[PDB]
Amino acid sequence: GKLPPYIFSPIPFLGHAIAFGKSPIEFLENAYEKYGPVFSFTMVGKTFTYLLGSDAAALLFNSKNEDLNAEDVYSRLTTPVFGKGVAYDVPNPVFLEQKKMLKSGLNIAHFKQHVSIIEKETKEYFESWGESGEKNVFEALSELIILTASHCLHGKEIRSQLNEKVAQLYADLAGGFSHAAWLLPGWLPLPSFRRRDRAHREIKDIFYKAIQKRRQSQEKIDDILQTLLDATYKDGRPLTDDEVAGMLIGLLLAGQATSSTTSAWMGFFLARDKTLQKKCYLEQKTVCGENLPPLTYDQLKDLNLLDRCIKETLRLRPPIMIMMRMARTPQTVAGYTIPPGHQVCVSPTVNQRLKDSWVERLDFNPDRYLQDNPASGEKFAYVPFGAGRHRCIGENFAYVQIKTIWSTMLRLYEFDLIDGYFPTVNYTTMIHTPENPVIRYKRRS
Ligand code: HEM
Numbered sequence: 330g331k332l333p334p335y336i337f338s339p340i341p342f343l344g345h346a347i348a349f350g351k352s353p354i355e356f357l358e359n360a361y362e363k364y365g366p367v368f369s370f371t372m373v374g375k376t377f378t379y380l381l382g383s384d385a386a387a388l389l390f391n392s393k394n395e396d397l398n399a400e401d402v403y404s405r406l407t408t409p410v411f412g413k414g415v416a417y418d419v420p421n422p423v424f425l426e427q428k429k430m431l432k433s434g435l436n437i438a439h440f441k442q443h444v445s446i447i448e449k450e451t452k453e454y455f456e457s458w459g460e461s462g463e464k465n466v467f468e469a470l471s472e473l474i475i476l477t478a479s480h481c482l483h484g485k486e487i488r489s490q491l492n493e494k495v496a497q498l499y500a501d502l503a504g505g506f507s508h509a510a511w512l513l514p515g516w517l518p519l520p521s522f523r524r525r526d527r528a529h530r531e532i533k534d535i536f537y538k539a540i541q542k543r544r545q546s547q548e549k550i551d552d553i554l555q556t557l558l559d560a561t562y563k564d565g566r567p568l569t570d571d572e573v574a575g576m577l578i579g580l581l582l583a584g585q586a587t588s589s590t591t592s593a594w595m596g597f598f599l600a601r602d603k604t605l606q607k608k609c610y611l612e613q614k615t616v617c618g619e620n621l622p623p624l625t626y627d628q629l630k631d632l633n634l635l636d637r638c639i640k641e642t643l644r645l646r647p648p649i650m651i652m653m654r655m656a657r658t659p660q661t662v663a664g665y666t667i668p669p670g671h672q673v674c675v676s677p678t679v680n681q682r683l684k685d686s687w688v689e690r691l692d693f694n695p696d697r698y699l700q701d702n703p704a705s706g707e708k709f710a711y712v713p714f715g716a717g718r719h720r721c722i723g724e725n726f727a728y729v730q731i732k733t734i735w736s737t738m739l740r741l742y743e744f745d746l747i748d749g750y751f752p753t754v755n756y757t758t759m760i761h762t763p764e765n766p767v768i769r770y771k772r773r774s
Contacts, residue, residue: 330659330666333378336360336370344371353650353756357381357679367663369671373512378671380662382683383707386675388662389654390709390717394421397654397673399719409515409525410505410582412533415575423562427576428722430560434482434553435722440729441626443481447730448624450477451737460772463747467593467766470734474589475499477730478581484554486539487577495535501528503582506759536574553577584723584730586760587648592731593766594646595638597752598693600744600768605695609635610739610773621740629732637695639731640704643681643713645693648760650678652715677712678761686710742770 338344349356349372357379360368366385369378380386389397404417416424454473458464475496480488505525515522540558549555557573568576599606609632613621616631653674660667667673682690686703687710698704704711714721721727738744745768752763 333367333369333665334364342374346372367665376671378667378673380675383709386709389675396658401655402653410502411579412575414572433556444624446480447477447733448737451734463769466768470592471589498528498532533574540570590648595642600746641695647677647713743773745769
């Protein structure tokens, strides 16, 4: 079996680590041109095989965890932040049971409740913005999305305990998602690691007293906490108070920097394209009514332009750039055999700008989906939340949360660039962030 084409590097251990780190997207696009869909190279003594394009990505998106393993690549980062016994610290079947439990609060019946929760939070938060100014929308959306996801997913006994202190602790635990946490051992006396371990212990404790409060409650609430508190594995094994907390902390942290970056990038795409922005505001009136009543789940699904703007934002600025698995069984793709031991990776970001499939690939064209597009015309060209089995379980909530916030924000304000500056992409963080994300705003009406 032919091994995928390898990119030679004169750098022994680091390999292509630095050239990749500077512009990973340009690195992979150039490799696609010179080497094709499947190629391999080493970074930090690890050998990576990338699957570019829809046909190649199919291998990972259709794979089973026995063949292409997730825990191998993601636990050393994850376990320190979310805690033991949860997510990638447990066998995949046990994780699948945890995932299904979480689904009990990730459905339409609950999303109808979430819409008015998120709208009200968006309004109350942006009270502090006044009538106009120049503020960092990324910092703002981070703070709002913490309060909104804690309210809808964690409950009101945790949301009432949410202050600036606890918001810092969540950012301290988010510091555990570093390249240093991935490569260097976790016990090392490094600053980010101590803040994670310290916050973890403190956040768990806030969650422990909220769990007890509910356990001794007269009435029951239909929400995710209630399920996790009253649920058992098939074995009949109950969840620990530690497991419940970790699953909740992990649920919120998975959709924070993912939703906060996307939400912010869309503002800039809409601030740059002023006519496209007003048309979205016009849709608020046409779909919901001239009185602009409180948003409903049903209304959100009729905001088609806004959906395409969210879709186009996710195409050009997806938060998760690489999806990674470890080869335990030899896999076959494009006539090559990937050897057990290679880390097989797919980049949604690259597949969603591949000149071979995307017309005007670098243009924010939300009407690209009203005509022939790779998102409908290929299986794995548009894969921002993943695909096949390896899909995001929070995708539907991400859409409700982002549509509700931005519907609410569009009603509240009109947005513009400051001297026509569009934020460059900060490639140095795992979730690519916008540089200098200060936006100009004024009151719409
Ligand atoms: C724009 C928003 C979001 C995007 C693009 C996104 C993207 C992704 C992707 C690509 C994965 C797959 C990772 C892998 O299998 O290697 C994933 C998994 C996951 N996401 Fe999201 N996500 C978003 C928002 C959220 C939200 C709002 C939540 C929860 C409320 C969430 C929770 C999760 C969880 C729990 C997983 C489980 C990983 C697994 O099953 O292996 N995400 N997400």
